[PDB]
């Protein structure tokens, strides 16, 4: 009956495509054609952080827009003070191969993970005075690509096993598993209301998940690996930067591909994607060693950061929109403003 | 202009700097190696050999030191077939150790394809490959039976003659070495098809009982370091 099921699936996919085309009366560029362009956005490297020993694979800001955690392949997880360049903590990891770092919203815990398939959650507010591994979540069958905190007790982790997980930290167990993707899930963005999250994988498809219920609501389709994903500040759109030079903006309420940010002079893959606080600027890190700032509505390039000697591997915009921190494969992070 | 607490925080940052400089010296003095191979390939045998004599966990690590030079050798388990995404973590490893079972001719062709994927990878474009054609005690016992001829799996063997080069000095059957050198050349051709800096394949013949594999790794890594010295420092 596999033929019958495949035929029904093909018919359903065609119905989805037809319905999604039936709601595409106008394109985002047509509506945006009248608003004035942003103009040259020239951001300068204010602070440069020079502590790590090897390539930086991830950063994540704190909710205070002051502290930030950076993970390097040297086995270090450095918690930096952005304003003063001071190093607040230097956690030595048990595994040197780290692909993700997460800073809890409360500022108490920080998460790391990588080839070890373990999500290591470290406690920073201990009475002992030193950072300790509070928990080691150990249920994945593939490398961790992204960890994000929901609160102090729940984490959401994307792994190379084609599955995402929602863990209760105290119990140490996977409360929920998300099992739709057909390839390695490389990125993960949590909606501001923390009830949904979009995961981009290597199947050239992003998937929107309901955390509370465990299902996959919508599947958005890119022509290569999706390496970074980031929600729009609204909570009703998101951006996916992929291995084909392209960052695409999708909208949940319409189940569409609103815009495709690409340029003929860009050939490398996007590693990181972030939005400015307003949502008007889409910052994307590239293998070309520089970050491009796109206008998220006119789909035109607005600026270039261009201050790194190796590929930009992580990008993050503070909660207050004050700065965009770029971490590349040279040890350095750069805080642009 | 800093407050008392700000000065104390700066001093703490400088102490962290000091531990980071010590960790930098430790990180530099150690050589990172990545071990790849198939399930058929004798690969845990090699880690056992260089360990004894010198869960769902993903990365397995093996310290071993040769002539006061420390080596961290990493084997990647509990991962799926596709490797194009976690292979980027190894853009800075000194050498990639590829173990290919020379005994199994049927699966040999896919071993060459895996080798080609490793060689022509945009991230390992500057990483040398130390190649171990493993399980050769099984190769001799397989080629001295006549029940499995390479021509049944590689049609070009019938027109291949051993080159006027270094035959195995000890007693070895002259067509055992022919088959061995054909397997070697099938990888050397892929290595030399697209060559660049820091990107040289060192082929070696090994077995399970061989206890000199660590020495071979040290010699090849020394040559890799010499090439990076000749290149980074502009001497070539």
């Amino acid at each position: 009956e596999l033929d019958q099921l495949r035929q029904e699936a093909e018919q359903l996919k065609n119905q989805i495509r037809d319905a999604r085309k039936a709601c595409a009366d106008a394109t985002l560029s047509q509506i945006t054609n009248n608003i004035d362009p942003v103009g040259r956005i020239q951001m300068r490297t204010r602070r440069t952080l020079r502590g790590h020993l090897a390539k930086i694979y991830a950063m994540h800001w704190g909710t205070d827009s002051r502290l930030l955690v950076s993970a390097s392949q040297d086995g270090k997880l450095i918690i930096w003070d952005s304003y003063t360049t001071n190093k607040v903590h230097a956690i030595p990891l048990r595994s040197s191969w780290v692909m993700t770092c997460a800073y809890a919203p409360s500022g108490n815990y920080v998460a790391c993970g990588g080839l070890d398939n373990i999500c290591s959650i470290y406690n920073l507010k201990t009475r002992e005075g030193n950072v300790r591994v509070s928990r080691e979540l150990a249920g994945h069958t593939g490398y961790l690509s992204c960890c994000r905190f929901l609160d102090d007790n729940q984490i959401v982790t994307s792994s190379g096993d084609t599955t995402c997980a929602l863990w209760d930290i105290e119990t140490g167990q996977q409360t929920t598993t998300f099992t739709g993707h057909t390839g390695d899930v490389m990125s993960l963005s949590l909606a501001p209301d923390t009830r949904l999250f979009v995961s981009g994988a290597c199947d050239a498809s992003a998937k929107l998940w309901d955390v509370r219920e465990g299902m996959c609501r919508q599947t958005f389709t890119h022509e290569s690996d999706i390496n970074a994903i980031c929600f729009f500040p609204n909570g009703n759109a998101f951006a996916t930067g992929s291995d084909d030079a392209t960052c695409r903006l999708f909208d949940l309420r319409a189940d569409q591909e609103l815009m495709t940010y690409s340029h003929d002079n860009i050939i490398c893959g996007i590693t990181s994607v972030s939005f400015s606080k307003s949502g008007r600027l889409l910052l994307a890190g590239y293998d070309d060693f520089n970050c491009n700032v796109w206008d998220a509505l006119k789909a035109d390039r607005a600026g270039v950061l261009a201050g790194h000697d190796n590929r930009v591997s992580c990008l993050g915009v503070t909660d207050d929109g004050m700065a965009v921190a770029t971490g590349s494969w040279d040890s350095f992070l750069k805080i642009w403003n | 202009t800093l407050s008392a607490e700000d000065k104390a925080a700066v001093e703490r940052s400088k102490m962290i700097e000091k531990q980071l400089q010590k960790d930098k010296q430790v990180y530099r003095r150690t050589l990172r190696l990545l071990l790849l191979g198939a399930d058929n390939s004798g690969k845990s045998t090699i880690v056992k050999q260089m360990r004894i004599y010198h869960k769902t966990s993903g990365i397995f690590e093996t310290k071993f030191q040769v002539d006061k030079v420390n080596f961290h050798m990493f084997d990647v388990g509990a991962q799926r077939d596709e490797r194009r995404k976690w292979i980027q973590c190894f853009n800075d490893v000194t050498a990639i150790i590829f173990v290919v079972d020379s005994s199994d001719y049927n699966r040999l062709q896919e071993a060459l394809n895996d080798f080609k994927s490793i060689w022509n990878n945009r991230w390992l474009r500057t990483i040398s490959v130390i190649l171990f054609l493993n399980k050769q005690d099984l190769l001799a016992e397989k080629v001295l039976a006549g029940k499995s001829k390479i021509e049944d799996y590689f049609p070009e063997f019938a027109r291949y003659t051993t080159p006027e080069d270094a035959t195995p000095e000890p007693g070895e059957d002259p067509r055992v070495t022919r088959a061995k050198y054909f397997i070697r050349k099938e990888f050397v051709d892929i290595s030399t098809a697209s060559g660049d800096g820091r990107h040289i394949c060192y082929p070696h013949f090994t077995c399970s009982v061989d206890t000199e594999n660590a020495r071979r790794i040290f010699n090849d890594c020394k040559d890799i370091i010499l090439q990076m010295n000749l290149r980074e420092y502009n001497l070539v």
Partner: single-chain antibody
Amino acid sequence: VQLVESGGGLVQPGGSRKLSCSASGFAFSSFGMHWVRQAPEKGLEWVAYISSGSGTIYYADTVKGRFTISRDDPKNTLFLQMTSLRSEDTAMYYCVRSIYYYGSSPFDFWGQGTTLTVSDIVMTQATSSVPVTPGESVSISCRSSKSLLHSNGNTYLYWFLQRPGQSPQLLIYRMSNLASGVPDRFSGSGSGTAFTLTISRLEAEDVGVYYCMQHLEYPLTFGAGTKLEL
């Protein structure tokens, strides 16, 4: 965390004595450590400070030259070598734990103290004693001769509580932040040169002497402390 100090007793004037506090239960090597003292019936007075890594040592004016502070990190013990003692140096000496980074809460833990008997941003706390009944809000205020609002943004005032017959316990750090383990009923407020601590719904087991300490510039000055009695 535990931090027990020893070495006190009778010292004839002009003598010398080594006070040693042993720290068990926390990362001693990564914490700056202070020596404070309380006279037989008086307030707290900062004595010395040895930084993490032993790279920054500060002494009080009435202490400088005579006292040498040092730490043995591997053995987890800090020593105050007191030379040429005087009658004014009699006190219960407390060893105070203190880390410094962004968000840190210095002066977290205090030792039980050693009794040693020998045979400047002035901070004023006018209320030397405030009568009170449990269940009612209290306000303890202290001023300063110099504004503590540094240009970076945070005012460096610390409110401590010393229950009868116990070591001081940190209540508020930096004039608005609540320490770890202190009830939410305590609140701190004010501006530079004027600070107020409010206890809403006062509940006994929190009566005792309240001190306010500056941390803008060394030496760290304390106050006389308001004595809340039930």
